[PDB]
């Protein structure tokens, strides 16, 4: 048997990192008024989406 | 003959140097991206009669 010295080392390192972020906002508002000498009217509407 | 060169080689070592070798290779990439847009709209009306 023929034995040869072969003292050796190898190293490898691979890493990946990722972040993804998405954001949305929506706002809506409506205000209405109505007037008559013997009547008053008001309406409001509000909407929010995230 | 072809098998002989395959199994024991066509040459033999007669002049060798005795050593240590070390190698390192390293790489890094980073990327970050940000983009955002905002819109705001206002519409107002006021109206009057007699």
How far is B34 from A22, CA to CA, in rounded Å? 10
How far is A19 from B31, CA to CA, in rounded Å? 10
Tokens 């909407």 belong to which residue? A47
Q: Helix (H, G, I), strand (E, B), or coil: what is residue B2?
A: helix
How far is A17 from B26, CA to CA, in rounded Å? 16
Q: How many alpha carbons lie under 13 Å from residue A39 in its C-beta half-sphere?
A: 6
Q: How many alpha carbons lie under 13 Å from residue A45 in its C-beta half-sphere?
A: 4
This PDB structure is determined at a resolution in Å of 2.6
Q: End-to-end CA distance of chain B, in Å?
A: 120
Q: Write the CB contacts of A45 (distance below 8 Å, at least 6 apart in sequence).
A: A28, A29, A30
How far is A21 from B34, CA to CA, in rounded Å? 9
Q: Helix (H, G, I), strand (E, B), or coil: what is residue B4?
A: helix
Structure determination technique employed: cryo-EM
How far is B41 from A28, CA to CA, in rounded Å? 10
Which of A36, A33, A27 is closest to B44 using CA atoms?
A: A33
């Amino acid at each position: 048997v023929d034995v040869q010295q072969n003292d050796s080392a190898t190293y490898t390192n691979v890493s990946g990192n990722t972040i993804s972020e998405y954001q949305r906002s929506l706002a809506t508002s409506v205000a209405i008024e109505g007037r008559y000498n013997f009547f008053s009217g008001s309406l409001s509407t509000d909407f929010d989406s995230n | 003959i072809s098998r002989y060169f395959d199994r024991v080689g066509s040459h033999f070592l007669t002049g060798i140097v005795m050593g240590g070798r070390a190698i390192l290779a390293s790489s890094t990439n980073k990327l970050r991206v940000k983009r955002d847009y905002s819109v705001s709209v206002v519409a107002k009306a006021s109206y009057e009669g007699l």
